[PDB]
Design a protein around this motif. Sequence first.
Motif, PDB file in Angstrom:
ATOM      1  N   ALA A  58      19.988 -10.934 -15.312  1.00 39.53           N
ATOM      2  CA  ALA A  58      21.056 -10.356 -14.310  1.00 39.53           C
ATOM      3  C   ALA A  58      21.447  -9.385 -14.477  1.00 39.53           C
TER       4      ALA A  58
ATOM      5  N   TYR B 100      34.174  -7.734 -22.491  1.00 38.29           N
ATOM      6  CA  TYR B 100      32.981  -8.128 -22.334  1.00 38.29           C
ATOM      7  C   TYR B 100      32.346  -9.307 -22.962  1.00 38.29           C
TER       8      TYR B 100
ATOM      9  N   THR C 282      18.965 -12.615 -20.355  1.00 39.06           N
ATOM     10  CA  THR C 282      19.335 -11.372 -20.738  1.00 39.06           C
ATOM     11  C   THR C 282      20.420 -10.767 -19.511  1.00 39.06           C
ATOM     12  N   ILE C 283      21.616 -10.427 -20.057  1.00 36.16           N
ATOM     13  CA  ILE C 283      22.607  -9.857 -19.197  1.00 36.16           C
ATOM     14  C   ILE C 283      22.969  -8.559 -19.488  1.00 36.16           C
ATOM     15  N   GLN C 284      22.895  -7.610 -18.627  1.00 30.59           N
ATOM     16  CA  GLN C 284      23.202  -6.089 -18.685  1.00 30.59           C
ATOM     17  C   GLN C 284      24.539  -6.108 -18.221  1.00 30.59           C
ATOM     18  N   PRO C 285      25.539  -5.598 -18.774  1.00 28.44           N
ATOM     19  CA  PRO C 285      26.896  -5.379 -18.258  1.00 28.44           C
ATOM     20  C   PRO C 285      26.695  -3.592 -18.032  1.00 28.44           C
ATOM     21  N   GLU C 286      27.197  -3.612 -16.479  1.00 28.67           N
ATOM     22  CA  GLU C 286      27.395  -2.472 -16.091  1.00 28.67           C
ATOM     23  C   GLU C 286      28.679  -2.010 -16.031  1.00 28.67           C
ATOM     24  N   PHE C 287      29.224  -1.256 -16.873  1.00 28.53           N
ATOM     25  CA  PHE C 287      30.613  -0.758 -17.028  1.00 28.53           C
ATOM     26  C   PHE C 287      30.943   0.074 -16.190  1.00 28.53           C
TER      27      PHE C 287
END
Lengths: 307, 307
Positions: free
Chosen positions: A271, A281, A301-306
């Motif tokens: 996501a 985070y 798998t987690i992608q942080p979109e700052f």
Amino acid sequence: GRNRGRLLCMLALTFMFMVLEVVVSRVTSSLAMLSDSFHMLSDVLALVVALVAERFARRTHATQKNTFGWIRAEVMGALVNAIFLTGLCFAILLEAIERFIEPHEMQQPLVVLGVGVAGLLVNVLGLCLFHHHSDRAGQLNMRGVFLHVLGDALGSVIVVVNALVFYFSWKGCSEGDFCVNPCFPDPCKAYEAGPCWVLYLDPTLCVVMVCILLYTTYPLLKESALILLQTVPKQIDIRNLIKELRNVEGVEEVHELHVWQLAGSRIIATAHIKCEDPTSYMEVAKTIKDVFHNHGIHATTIQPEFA
Amino acid sequence: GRNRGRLLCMLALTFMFMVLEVVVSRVTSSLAMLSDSFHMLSDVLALVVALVAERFARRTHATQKNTFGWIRAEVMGALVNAIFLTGLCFAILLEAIERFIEPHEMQQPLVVLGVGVAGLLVNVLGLCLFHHHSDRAGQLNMRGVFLHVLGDALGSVIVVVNALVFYFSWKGCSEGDFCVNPCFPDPCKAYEAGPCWVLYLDPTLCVVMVCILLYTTYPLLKESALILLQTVPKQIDIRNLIKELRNVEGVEEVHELHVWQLAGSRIIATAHIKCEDPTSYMEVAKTIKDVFHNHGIHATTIQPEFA
Ligand SMILES: [Zn+2]
Ligand SMILES: [Zn+2]
């Protein structure tokens, strides 16, 4: 180990019964026995496909060609086994019709009955071997072979019953003197035979048989063919995941949620989740991973979109 | 639109030729024509599977059941078509053997030749319709249909040639007066026939035919069955990706990289990439995404594991 042992045992009995059919045809000089032997060779092919899937599935391991392993290969084995059975069931249905439009007499009923009983015993032994599969990838791979064994076991039962009914209720014209054959229209010729109901016993039952198989085939061709389409596992629903990830503090949105099943109980979800503070985070992501583990998804798998 | 139009057109011609076979059998009172009609019904089933795959593949939209869409469904359609064709090729091989051990005479050669020519024309029309496929899935779904059309076109060619050779070089015993049939062992009976080479023309060619099909079937059953196993696309290799991601500053390691092909040119790769400074994470991740786009991977997910 155990699964490969069962598959090898059934393959060995299948070759032994193939040899039995061939030798019996040789002494009796019958060709339909050879055709049935080649159908047993088709069963051999199904068992071989199952064996190939079961070995290769052990690889697991991150290879260069497949970074996930080869458990999905076992899943594919299950799938292909199911499609070969839908196909052979459809061929049985088309042979049944071909026998409806033109009935076939059975010659040498006693040897046919004996070979059918032997095949029934072999198929019952195989069914007992594969009874445990009516983790999951193993269940699907063994269910394919179990369905094949059930199919040719039902075929053996049909053959035995048909041979018995022929031997008990069919008065043939093979004697050669003053016999008329009403049911079988032209007895190849340029009394009255047995009642016409017996000559159609093989088709009708066969039709019923395939229906049974098709019914029991449908879940497998449903279960195996939806895993390779990356359908969300039934235990998982997307609305709860979306709302629970949105309710987590530090999560602005959940822009792209992808959930699928690799094989068995290995569910993979990736996501993209927006976060405001890079400092928060790590705890936000650990909470998200805790939620994913709570709902049964262990590889993420987690992608942080700052922003 | 165009693909569904082609599939519907071929399906319509297939029903029309089915009706032609049925009516011709009715006037001629032949049953093998009905059997060939049911084989054309099997071709109808293959076309129906292709149509279902094509229709479902246009969904996408990230359904609740499948968060990815249904393009993989089209891929599966290709796969199942290939499997079905392999099975029918193996059934042709087993029929060929059954005709080797017991040859079959062809009755009414002229009508068989005419129906074979009509089927050849229909199959050539279908082959011309499906010539463009010798996105990618669109190709795989159609290559499946193209292989089915090539298979029954080769069958039509074999039938035409066999009927011509029978009509030109086979001297039958159907006249009824003083004829001995050496090749066909028992002419059902309780001059000399045609040379024995003609009676085996149908099997041998058929065997050759299936080989051709099997050869041309192998890439599809290779190409479609490796996409659903999530094998890395051939254009992509893992060593270059690993080394290039490691060479990027701010990357300590790429802990898990999974890269697979969804359908056609949609390649999905997810990875874990440890980073030291959250402040530098955004430019590091944009560089990583630039590399993934450089190698042809457009949908990714990258989780930074700060340590
Ligand atoms: Zn994004
Ligand atoms: Zn990790």
